[PDB]
Amino acid sequence: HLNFTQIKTVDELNQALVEAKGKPVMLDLYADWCVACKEFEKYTFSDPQVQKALADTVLLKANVTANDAQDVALLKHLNVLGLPTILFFDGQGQEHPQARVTGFMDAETFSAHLRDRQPGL
């Protein structure tokens, strides 16, 4: 498995970003009831090459299973309309919406995505 850092609230994301100054960041939105999210963990985040490509990236994950106030506020703040969703941030903590992943991608597809669209790297 890849080593993610759990963040819960909008401001935990913001702090995490401020701390990752100078480094590329990726945020995975996850939920227990999300099937394709599970596919990502089992088939994509598990790929040896995908992992090496993410070796020097700050990895963040928000677990939104409960769908509580904080989860909803976060999803709303990120303008996330569904799962799975992966966000990407540059060294200046700025997100690149044009780099979002909103469906499942297998290892190969995701590898090409990181190669062609990942910010800050």
Author numbering: 428 to 548
Give sentences from the paper.
The transmembrane thiol:disulfide oxidoreductase DsbD is a three-domain protein responsible for shuttling electrons from the cytoplasm to the oxidizing periplasm of Gram-negative bacteria.
Despite the presence of reducing agent (TCEP) in the mother liquor, both proteins were found to be oxidized with a Cys-461–Cys-464 disulfide bond clearly present. Cys-461, Cys-464, Asp-455, and Glu-468 of Q488K-cDsbD overlay well with the same residues of wild-type cDsbD. However, unlike E. coli thioredoxin where Lys-57 forms a salt bridge with Asp-26 (equivalent to Asp-455 in cDsbD), Lys-488 is in close proximity to Glu-468, and the two residues have hydrogen bond interactions with a bridging water molecule. Asp-455, which in the wild-type domain forms a hydrogen bond to the side chain of Gln-488, is just hydrated in Q488K-cDsbD but still remains almost completely buried (side chain solvent accessibility 6%) leading to an elevated pKa of 7.5. The Nz of Lys-488 is more than 11 Å away from the thiol group of Cys-461; therefore, this positive charge does not affect the pKa value of Cys-461. The closer proximity of Lys-488 to Asp-455 ensures that this residue has a lower pKa value (7.5) than observed for Cys-461 (10.5). Therefore, we can conclude that Q488K-cDsbD has similar biophysical properties to the wild-type domain, and Q488K-DsbD functions equally effectively as wild-type DsbD in vivo.
